[PDB]
Amino acid sequence: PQAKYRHDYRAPDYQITDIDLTFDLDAQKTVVTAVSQAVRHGASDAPLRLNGEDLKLVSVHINDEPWTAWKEEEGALVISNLPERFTLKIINEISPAANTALEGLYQSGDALCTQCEAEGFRHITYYLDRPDVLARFTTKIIADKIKYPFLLSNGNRVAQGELENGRHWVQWQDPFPKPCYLFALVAGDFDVLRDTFTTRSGREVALELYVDRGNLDRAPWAMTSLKNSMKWDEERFGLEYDLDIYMIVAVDFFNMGAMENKGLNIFNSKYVLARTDTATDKDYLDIERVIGHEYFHNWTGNRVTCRDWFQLSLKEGLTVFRDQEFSSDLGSRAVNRINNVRTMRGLQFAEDASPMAHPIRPDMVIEMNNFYTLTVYEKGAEVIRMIHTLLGEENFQKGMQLYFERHDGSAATCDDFVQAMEDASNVDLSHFRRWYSQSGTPIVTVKDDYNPETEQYTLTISQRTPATPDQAEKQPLHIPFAIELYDNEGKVIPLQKGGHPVNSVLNVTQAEQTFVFDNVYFQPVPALLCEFSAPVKLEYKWSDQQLTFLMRHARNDFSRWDAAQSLLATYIKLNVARHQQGQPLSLPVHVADAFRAVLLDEKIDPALAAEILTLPSVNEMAELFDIIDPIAIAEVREALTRTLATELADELLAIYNANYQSEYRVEHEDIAKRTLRNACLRFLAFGETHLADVLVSKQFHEANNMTDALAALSAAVAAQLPCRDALMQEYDDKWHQNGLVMDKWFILQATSPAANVLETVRGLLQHRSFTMSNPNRIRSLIGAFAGSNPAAFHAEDGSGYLFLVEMLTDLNSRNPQVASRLIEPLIRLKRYDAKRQEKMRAALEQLKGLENLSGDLYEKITKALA
Numbered sequence: 001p002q003a004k005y006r007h008d009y010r011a012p013d014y015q016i017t018d019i020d021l022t023f024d025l026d027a028q029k030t031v032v033t034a035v036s037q038a039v040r041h042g043a044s045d046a047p048l049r050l051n052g053e054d055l056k057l058v059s060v061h062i063n064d065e066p067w068t069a070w071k072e073e074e075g076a077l078v079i080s081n082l083p084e085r086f087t088l089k090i091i092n093e094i095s096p097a098a099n100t101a102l103e104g105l106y107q108s109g110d111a112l113c114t115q116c117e118a119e120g121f122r123h124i125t126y127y128l129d130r131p132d133v134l135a136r137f138t139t140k141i142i143a144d145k146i147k148y149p150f151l152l153s154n155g156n157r158v159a160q161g162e163l164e165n166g167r168h169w170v171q172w173q174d175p176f177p178k179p180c181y182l183f184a185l186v187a188g189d190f191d192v193l194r195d196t197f198t199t200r201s202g203r204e205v206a207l208e209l210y211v212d213r214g215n216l217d218r219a220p221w222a223m224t225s226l227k228n229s230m231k232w233d234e235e236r237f238g239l240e241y242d243l244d245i246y247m248i249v250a251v252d253f254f255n256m257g258a259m260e261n262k263g264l265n266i267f268n269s270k271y272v273l274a275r276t277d278t279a280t281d282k283d284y285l286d287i288e289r290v291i292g293h294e295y296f297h298n299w300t301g302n303r304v305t306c307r308d309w310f311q312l313s314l315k316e317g318l319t320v321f322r323d324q325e326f327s328s329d330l331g332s333r334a335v336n337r338i339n340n341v342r343t344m345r346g347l348q349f350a351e352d353a354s355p356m357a358h359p360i361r362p363d364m365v366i367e368m369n370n371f372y373t374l375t376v377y378e379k380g381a382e383v384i385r386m387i388h389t390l391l392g393e394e395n396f397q398k399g400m401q402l403y404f405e406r407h408d409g410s411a412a413t414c415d416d417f418v419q420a421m422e423d424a425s426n427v428d429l430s431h432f433r434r435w436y437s438q439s440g441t442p443i444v445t446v447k448d449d450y451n452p453e454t455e456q457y458t459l460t461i462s463q464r465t466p467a468t469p470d471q472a473e474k475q476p477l478h479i480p481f482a483i484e485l486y487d488n489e490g491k492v493i494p495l496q497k498g499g500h501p502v503n504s505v506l507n508v509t510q511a512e513q514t515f516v517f518d519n520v521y522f523q524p525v526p527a528l529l530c531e532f533s534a535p536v537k538l539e540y541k542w543s544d545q546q547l548t549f550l551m552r553h554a555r556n557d558f559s560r561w562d563a564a565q566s567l568l569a570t571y572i573k574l575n576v577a578r579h580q581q582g583q584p585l586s587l588p589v590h591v592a593d594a595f596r597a598v599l600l601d602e603k604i605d606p607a608l609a610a611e612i613l614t615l616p617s618v619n620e621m622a623e624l625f626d627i628i629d630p631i632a633i634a635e636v637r638e639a640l641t642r643t644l645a646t647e648l649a650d651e652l653l654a655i656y657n658a659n660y661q662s663e664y665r666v667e668h669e670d671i672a673k674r675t676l677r678n679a680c681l682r683f684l685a686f687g688e689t690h691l692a693d694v695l696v697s698k699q700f701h702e703a704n705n706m707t708d709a710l711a712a713l714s715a716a717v718a719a720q721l722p723c724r725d726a727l728m729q730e731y732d733d734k735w736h737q738n739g740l741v742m743d744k745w746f747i748l749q750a751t752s753p754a755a756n757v758l759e760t761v762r763g764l765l766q767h768r769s770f771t772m773s774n775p776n777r778i779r780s781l782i783g784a785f786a787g788s789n790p791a792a793f794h795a796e797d798g799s800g801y802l803f804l805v806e807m808l809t810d811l812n813s814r815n816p817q818v819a820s821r822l823i824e825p826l827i828r829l830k831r832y833d834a835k836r837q838e839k840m841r842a843a844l845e846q847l848k849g850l851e852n853l854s855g856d857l858y859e860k861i862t863k864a865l866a
């Protein structure tokens with residue numbers, strides 16, 4: 001399995017300008033005929049090298065002449081002695097029914113569908129499977145009419161006929177040149193929700209949402225979100241849809257969440273199907289996000305695509321930035337910013353400290369599907385947001401406009417995008433480009449001084465990025481560091497120096513620098529790195545009272561929540577050391593009081609109150625420690641929950657009851673009150689046992705929506721309440737026929753604090769609703785245990801590791817892309833104590849000796865064992 005290197009990029013020897021595909025479709029045996037119009041660019045003696053995986057070649061013709069100057073090798077068809085321009089015809093067979101890996105053409109229940117990104121099209125036919133080759137596709141599909149009445153591909157429906165023996169065919173044509181990763185085909189029998197969107201310039205777009213028969217009742221919300229996404233992209237970015245049809249197909253069997261195939265998105269049905277009794281507020285907001293995200297790729301990804309896969313972040317970071325802007329504009333900006341920062345600090349930082357650490361533009365890749373990461377996505381989007389911060393909205397939109405103007409119709413690079421932002425704005429981004437090529441999280445250390453005699457405040461800011469496995473050399477970055485200074489009244493002190501205003505976004509571009517502010521009439525309380533202005537670790541010696549002052553006075557809701565996190569961080573760390581010495585929780589009175597004040601603040605946005613009253617996850621808590629103690633973290637989280645439930649019992653029950661809502665609305669103000677109410681419930685579940693059991697049981701049974709019912713069930717599990725087993729059994733009996741709803745239940749089982757959690761998880765491998773054939777079920781049961789129950793996964797007897805090895809031994813052959821998502825908890829071994837590393841190392845060595853080890857797992861295992 002060979003590494004590929006970004007510095008090896010070379011323009012292709014041949015282009016394909018047009019491809020005409022014919023699928024004679026059958027689950028056991030599909031015959032693909034592919035007629036491509038090719039043009040030599042390279043040396044006249046260069047062979048055409050086509051990618052192909054698991055393809056049965058039937059014939060090779062060049063201008064209709066059967067070709068003798070070719071050979072097959074590992075993953076390729078090499079064709080020699082070609083004219084400068086020619087028609088390539090390939091005929092080959094593939095077998096959808098045998099495709100367990102779910103890449104290329106496969107079976108989803110009774111449907112046939114495709115997944116081609118990153119390199120899945122070479123599983124369908126021999127092709128230039130590289131994103132800088134853009135061709136105009138036309139696609140004829142021939143299939144059994146009763147089994148596949150709907151035959152879908154990208155673009156517009158240009159031809160159709162019937163044939164003998166109950167077959168029919170449809171031809172599609174997509175006028176936009178595309179890399180083959182954007183190719184899609186779907187065959188099956190669906191219910192179809194149809195609607196329309198009229199674009200701002202009056203183009204009328206048929207919207208079509210394909211769902212399994214019987215699911216039309218779960219489709220309107222995805223349709224609404226689609227129109228919302230199209231409207232928003234017009235208002236915010238000035239971007240209109242460019243075709244006449246927009247199709248989305250919800251499939252149950254899918255390795256990822258969704259895919260932006262031009263004019264024909266394929267979606268995991270998890271990101272389509274919602275009804276108020278099956279779906280939570282979080283599902284609704286996720287559907288909106290993911291619908292919007294694939295929609296936004298129509299421009300940032302499709303109209304302008306990626307020159308090579310090392311440029312992935314060019315589309316993913318930028319499209320994540322967009323879906324965050326969408327969610328934030330439509331919903332609560334503060335809650336969105338808070339949650340995206342949780343993800344950054346709790347999940348992405350961990351990856352940047354891992355053996356899989358990489359720059360947002362990687363330099364080296366063995367298996368490209370291994371790089372659809374928190375780094376390329378979430379940190380990518382933080383980098384885009386820093387550009388936005390440096391340029392401001394107006395110049396940022398100008399840089400978007402110049403980007404499309406220069407690159408519409410072509411495959412571009414990260415550096416092109418930076419270049420467009422830089423030229424449109426006249427902001428210098430040459431230093432800034434270092435964020436693309438350097439991995440690891442910078443640590444920004446702040447020291448301050450107030451001088452009463454000169455009324456000057458001085459910040460001495462430094463930065464370093466520790467070395468990572470992949471990079472021995474590190475250099476300072478261009479770090480936009482936003483500050484605000486508060487006087488004793490909570491008023492913002494104007495920033496200025498020598499009689500002139502100073503931008504509150506400081507340019508931290510050196511290893512060490514000093515910033516001096518004048519006319520600081522009172523010793524300030526600083527808010528630092530406001531709105532998480534650079535993806536960095538902040539090191540500043542806060543006092544508790546600086547932090548409670550910020551919770552009370554900071555202008556932006558994000559800084560209030562962030563202050564609360566810095567306050568908690570101190571006491572999480574205190575109490576994990578205590579836990580390790582056998583000592584019970586200790587928390588000063590004035591900390592509990594900051595949280596009492598939040599509960600009883602009548603002016604606070606409930607959306608903000610709810611986030612402050614949501615404790616860091618065990619994953620955000622882990623990132624406060626060099627060496628992770630997963631059991632101490634888990635138990636301290638619980639003890640902190642119990643302590644606050646006891647100290648704030650009366651205030652919690654009052655705020656819980658005050659936020660009752662008899663109507664269920666998917667509306668942001670209602671979501672916010674319900675999130676606060678359920679945050680109050682979480683603590684109440686951990687107070688006095690009889691009261692808790694009554695409250696939780698009652699909520700589960702009286703809920704008129706899945707949000708309140710799951711919140712209850714999930715508190716029953718978390719606090720191991722007496723009602724737990726009956727409620728869990730009831731949900732099983734009601735919902736077992738419905739995989740997406742049962743995924744919620746598998747997650748709760750997988751993340752239970754019960755002593756016997758692993759025994760229960762293993763038994764659930766035999767559950768009526770579970771199957772190894774379904775990525776959703778695998779992730780919900782096995783992935784949630786290994787990744788979201790660190791206390792049990794890291795049981796000291798090493799039983800967690802052995803369990804995962806067993807599962808990955810299966811999945812390595814069945815579905816390597818899911819195997820490689822699931823191995824991730826094991827590759828974090830260097831973060832754990834020496835006894836744990838030794839057991840995890842041993843598990844990894846077991847996996848490395850597997851016969852037919854997939855490249856997907858090979859890459860991670862070898863970096864981890866190094």
Ligand SMILES: CC(C)C[C@H](NC(=O)[C@@H](O)[C@H](N)Cc1ccccc1)C(=O)O
Pocket residue numbers: 117118256257258259260289290293294297316320323369372377
């Ligand atoms: C980031 C989210 C909004 C959803 C996310 N999907 C995407 O990013 C799509 O735009 C990707 N282009 C789909 C993808 C993901 C992983 C591997 C190959 C292809 C997914 O998880 O599928």
Ligand SMILES: [Zn+2]
Pocket residue numbers: 293294297315316319
């Ligand atoms: Zn994407």
